[PDB]
Amino acid sequence: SVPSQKTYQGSYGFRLGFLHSGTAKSVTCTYSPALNKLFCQLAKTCPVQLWVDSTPPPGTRVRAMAIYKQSQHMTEVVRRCPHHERCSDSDGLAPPQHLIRVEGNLRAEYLDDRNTFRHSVVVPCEPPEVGSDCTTIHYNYMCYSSCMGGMNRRPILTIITLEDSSGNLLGRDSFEVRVCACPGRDRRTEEENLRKK
Ligand SMILES: O=C(O)c1cc(-c2ccc(F)cc2)c(-n2cccc2)c(I)c1O
Ligand SMILES: [Zn+2]
Numbered sequence: 001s002v003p004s005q006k007t008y009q010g011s012y013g014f015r016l017g018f019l020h021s022g023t024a025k026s027v028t029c030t031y032s033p034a035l036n037k038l039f040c041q042l043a044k045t046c047p048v049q050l051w052v053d054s055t056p057p058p059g060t061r062v063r064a065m066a067i068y069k070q071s072q073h074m075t076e077v078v079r080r081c082p083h084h085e086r087c088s089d090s091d092g093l094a095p096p097q098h099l100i101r102v103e104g105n106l107r108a109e110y111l112d113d114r115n116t117f118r119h120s121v122v123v124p125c126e127p128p129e130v131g132s133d134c135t136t137i138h139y140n141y142m143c144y145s146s147c148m149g150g151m152n153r154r155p156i157l158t159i160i161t162l163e164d165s166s167g168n169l170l171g172r173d174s175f176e177v178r179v180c181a182c183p184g185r186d187r188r189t190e191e192e193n194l195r196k197k
Pocket of ligand 1: 055
C-alpha cells in the first residue's frame with residue numbers, strides 16, 4: 001500500500017551521493033544536504049551517485065520510485081499530469097505516464113506494478129569506470145511539482161532501492177525532490193526558511 005522509506009545500508013554499505021552544484025540562478029539541478037532535498041528543472045539531468053563498501057553480486061539492480069511525502073497522499077500513485085502524459089516526449093522506452101526516467105541507459109526497465117499500480121525504473125548495477133570510486137545514474141523528472149492534476153504542489157520523495165535479481169531488498173536510501181523553474185533560488189529560499197526556524 002505504501003513503500004517503505006527507511007534508510008538501510010545493508011550488507012554492502014549502500015548509500016547515495018550528490019554533486020555540489022551550488023545555487024546560482026542558472027543551475028539546473030542542485031542538492032541540499034540540510035533538507036535532504038534535490039531541486040531540479042523539468043527533464044534535466046540529475047546525477048545521483050551510488051556508493052558501496054563492498055561489491056554486490058552480479059545481477060544486483062537499482063530501482064527508483066516516487067511517493068508523496070505527506071501521509072494523507074502517500075497511497076496515491078505519483079504519475080505525470082494530464083498534460084505531460086500526452087505531450088509525446090517519449091524516449092522510446094519510458095511509458096509516457098512515468099515521472100522518473102533514466103537517461104542514456106538502454107538496459108533501463110520500466111515497471112507498472114500489477115498490484116499497486118506504482119511506477120518505477122530499474123537498471124542493472126555496473127561497476128565504476130576505471131579511475132572512479134562510485135557509479136552515477138542520470139535521472140530525469142518529467143513533470144513540475146506544481147503541475148495541475150498531477151503532483152499539484154505536493155512534495156514527493158524518491159526512494160532508491162538496491163535489489164537482488166529476484167527484487168529482494170539489499171539497501172535503501174531516499175531524498176525529497178522539487179521540480180521547479182529556478183532550483184537555485186528555491187534551494188536558497190528553503191534553506192533560509194529552515195535556518196529561520
Ligand atoms: O567497487 C565496485 O566493485 C563496485 C561495484 C558495483 C557493482 C558492479 C556490478 C554489479 F553486478 C553489482 C555491483 C557498484 N554498484 C553499481 C551500482 C550499484 C553498486 C559499485 I557503486 C561499486 O563501487
Ligand atoms: Zn506535468
